[PDB]
């Protein structure tokens, strides 16, 4: 509709899921698709084979808005980080810049003392 | 760990020194 023709793509690449939200610079997330929620569930079947599913549906989810050249920045590590870049670029989009800006701390808090086995 | 990381950075200096 508004047809900004560009935008900053978001890849919250977590580990069990990698949801992607598409938006321009003002932070107006208009479209999004979830890798582990693209029909798929579980963990190893929510891995990046599902990330490209989410990428293609999101491309379909916002193809009505006509966004040609695409900026993308990523959060978090994980397999749902690389394959989705190629998927979204091949899915009728053009790239602007790729980065994972995952917020490393300056030793602020405590994350858990998780699995030990 | 609050006590390991000063030990591995002072052990693996056996690993990665030579």
């Amino acid at each position: 509709r508004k047809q900004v023709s560009d935008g900053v793509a978001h890849i919250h690449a977590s580990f069990n899921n990698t949801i992607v939200t598409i938006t321009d610079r003002q932070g107006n997330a208009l479209g999004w698709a979830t890798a582990g929620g693209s029909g798929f569930r579980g963990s190893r079947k929510s891995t990046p084979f599902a990330a490209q599913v989410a990428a293609e549906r999101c491309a379909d989810a916002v193809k009505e808005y006509g966004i040609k050249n695409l900026e993308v920045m990523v959060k978090g590590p994980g397999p749902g980080r690389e394959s989705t870049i190629r998927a979204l670029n091949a899915a009728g989009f053009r790239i602007t810049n790729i980065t994972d800006v995952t917020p490393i701390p300056h030793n602020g808090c405590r994350p858990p003392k998780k699995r030990r086995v | 760990f609050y006590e390991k990381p000063t030990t591995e950075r002072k052990r693996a200096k056996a690993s990665a020194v030579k």
Binding site: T47, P48, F49, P79, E82, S83, R86 | -
Partner: protein, 150 residues
């Protein structure tokens, strides 16, 4: 493994003088039957010219470009764990598998005789069908799409 063997040296076609055609009868040999293959595959190849209607000495490959393989599964259980790891085809298999893609559906098709049943499937590739053709349709699926694990 560590040692290697060179490719066995082969004399050319006893009839057309072309080593590539001579190798072809060697794969179809089951029950040790080249003399029968003389009345089966040599009788087939002789008919392949006029049925094609052109010189089958170098026009013989006008139906093989699509058949060109690129990848096959190599079972590297590296470190004790089987992986996909499709290695790109090296010349000692990409042409052998081309002949391995020929007579998979040409034994008991229910026709006159495989003296000329095989003489039905060959022009089909330059008539856009036959066994060698759809072989490359399935190879594209296993590679080029599993980059996260390929």
């Amino acid at each position: 493994r560590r040692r290697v063997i060179g490719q066995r040296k082969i004399l050319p076609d006893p009839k057309f003088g072309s080593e590539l055609l001579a190798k072809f009868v060697n794969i179809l040999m089951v029950d040790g039957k080249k003399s029968t293959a003389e009345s089966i595959v040599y009788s087939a190849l002789e008919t392949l010219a006029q049925r094609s209607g052109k010189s089958e000495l170098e026009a013989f490959e006008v139906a093989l470009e699509n058949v060109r393989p690129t990848v096959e599964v190599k079972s590297r259980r590296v470190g004790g764990s089987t992986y996909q790891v499709p290695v790109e085809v090296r010349p000692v298999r990409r042409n052998a598998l081309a002949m391995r893609w020929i007579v998979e559906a040409a034994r008991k098709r229910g026709d006159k005789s495989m003296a000329l049943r095989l003489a039905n499937e060959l022009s089909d590739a330059a008539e856009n069908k036959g066994t060698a053709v759809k072989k490359r349709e399935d190879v594209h699926r296993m590679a080029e799409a599993n980059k996260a694990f390929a």
